[PDB]
Design a binder for this molecule. Structure first.
Ligand SMILES: [Cl-]
Length: 288
């Protein structure tokens, strides 16, 4: 249906190793591409224990298959095996940006570096008329040497000539733009709001309203003034957040524009410097 390139018998080409993740969809496993010995991530979904989101799982494969960017998790293919569908993607062993927050706070160079790479991902997606719709630190994954990529396209949307806006209530409430919660007509500017919340998340460790029940934020977000970054942070970082978190979507800058923001230019450095953060998490995790 949109599965034209669905492949068969994955275990000839890949080796399944241990489990590494879980979600509403099913489960995620480490694996090996037996042709290259590169390590991959295999998302496995039980088609029979699946229902309704079958319509989503296809959409996810569709979006993934259409992305070709170093800032988006590489897509290897979807494979059918008895009752299970394998969705095989690039493996990234550095941890998510949310993981890297667990041991302690980031500094603004690290925040800027991570945001700059997220922005390159968003610029790529939005130039392809795609909207991620679940931007948050947990879906920003790093290689063990500091490359930063967007992941989890489970609720990603696509715009077309006949569908210039979306309306669907998707995303993670703390990070959702007010127009998405209202289910008004929205586009890639929704991702820019979520990016602003993600910036606060990277700076403070958690998004606004994080101690509240997510249902409460469904009225708080459309109603309240937009969040701001409070605390002892640089003015350009605070202005970066402010630019993103405008209630009116057309007043938010594009990802391209944000790549030239003073905060990004003054503070972002080489991604390889992020190995320091990756090492911190490994040490921290080993002693938990
Ligand atoms: Cl890696």
């Amino acid at each position: 249906p949109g599965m034209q390139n669905l492949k068969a018998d994955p275990e000839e080409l890949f080796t399944k190793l241990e489990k590494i993740g879980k979600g509403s969809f099913g489960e995620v496993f480490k694996g090996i591409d037996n042709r290259t010995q590169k390590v991959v991530a295999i998302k496995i979904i039980d088609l029979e224990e699946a229902e309704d989101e079958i319509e989503d799982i296809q959409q996810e494969i569709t979006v993934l298959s259409q992305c070709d960017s170093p800032y988006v998790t590489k897509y290897y293919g979807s494979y059918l095996k008895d009752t299970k569908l394998w969705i095989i993607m690039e493996y990234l062993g550095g941890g998510s940006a949310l993981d890297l927050l667990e041991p302690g706070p980031l500094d603004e160079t690290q925040i800027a570096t991570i945001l700059r790479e997220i922005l390159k991902g968003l610029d790529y997606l939005h130039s392809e008329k795609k909207i991620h719709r679940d931007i948050k630190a947990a879906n920003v994954l790093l290689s063990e040497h500091g490359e930063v990529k967007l992941a989890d396209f489970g609720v990603a949307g696509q715009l077309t000539d006949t569908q210039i806006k979306r309306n669907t209530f998707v995303g993670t409430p703390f990070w959702m733009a007010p127009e998405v919660i209202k289910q008004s007509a929205y586009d890639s500017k929704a991702d820019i709001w979520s990016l602003g919340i993600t910036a606060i998340e990277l700076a403070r460790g958690e998004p606004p309203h994080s101690e509240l029940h997510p249902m409460k934020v469904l009225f708080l977000i459309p109603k309240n003034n937009p969040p701001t970054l409070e605390g002892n942070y640089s003015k350009p970082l605070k202005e970066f957040v402010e630019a993103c978190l405008n209630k009116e979507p057309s007043f938010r800058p594009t990802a391209k524009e944000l790549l030239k923001h003073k905060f990004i230019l003054r503070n972002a450095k080489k991604t390889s410097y992020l190995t320091e953060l990756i090492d911190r998490y490994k040490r921290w995790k080993a002693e938990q």
